[PDB]
Nucleic acid binder design. Structure first.
Length: 49
DNA sequence: ACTGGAGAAAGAAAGTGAAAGGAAGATAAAACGGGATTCATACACCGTTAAATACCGGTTTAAAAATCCCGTGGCGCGTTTTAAAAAATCTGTGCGGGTGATTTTAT
């Protein structure tokens, strides 16, 4: 952490494709993102395919 | 007596709180105009007949149509203005993580 007295995970070991099913939206310097949500069953079927 | 700093007086310029009023808005009461019923009453449709009008044959004649000469103003051309519509260019705004700040009451 900032004081060097704790530990924080670098990334989560997720079982869910969260990015596609929930989307995202943010504004940065020189760029931006905009992603719509989706349906979980269709994403799972696509991953299996 | 003279000098230079400092404090106090006096005077002039700028900011101020309050000002009728008037065009510019805003809000209600009123007069209006457009639908649903309800019939009595005048209007639409059907047989009959005297009468008023359309039609044919032949004149005519006075009025309107046709023709010629001319002298103009009313359209036509070329070149400018001027609004009107269209294309181009600016102005706000909200989505989600970040930085920093404000106010009123009771005992």
């Amino acid at each position: 952490n900032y004081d060097g007295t704790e530990k924080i995970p670098d990334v989560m070991p997720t079982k869910i494709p969260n990015l596609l099913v929930n989307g995202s939206s943010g504004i940065a310097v020189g760029m931006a993102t905009n992603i719509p949500p989706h349906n979980l069953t269709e994403v799972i079927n696509g991953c299996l395919a």
